[PDB]
Amino acid sequence: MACPLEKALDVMVSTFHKYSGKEGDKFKLNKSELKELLTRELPSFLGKRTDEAAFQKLMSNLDSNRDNEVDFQEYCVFLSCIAMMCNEFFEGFPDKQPRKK
């Protein structure tokens, strides 16, 4: 197996250069770049059902400078916030209903 936490940072810049250097810059991801990125290595974080709709809030929340182009700045906070995601998405609240009465 790989070095878990090491690969985290490694694949960040690795995958960062994978799908961004498709349309334009290798450090700049427009919608379609992130799209393919997530569809490939983050499909679990897409529910296997991501159109430009689920990506709308994604791109939006990433776009902190508000130009709609995820620079590395918007990218690191993309992933690190998916850490925080993955802790809730760990169980992923799959209809968790307790009965107190």
Binding site: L62, E74, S80, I82, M85, F89
Partner: protein, 39 residues
Amino acid sequence: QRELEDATETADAMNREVSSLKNKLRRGDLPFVVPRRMA
């Protein structure tokens, strides 16, 4: 499905500190840093 709504919502938050934090990690007082590669 749209985890990225609640997930990377915080990205805009972390992003402001991230640029400052990644700046304090490279400040020089830090012991740890990224090598030329992943070494």
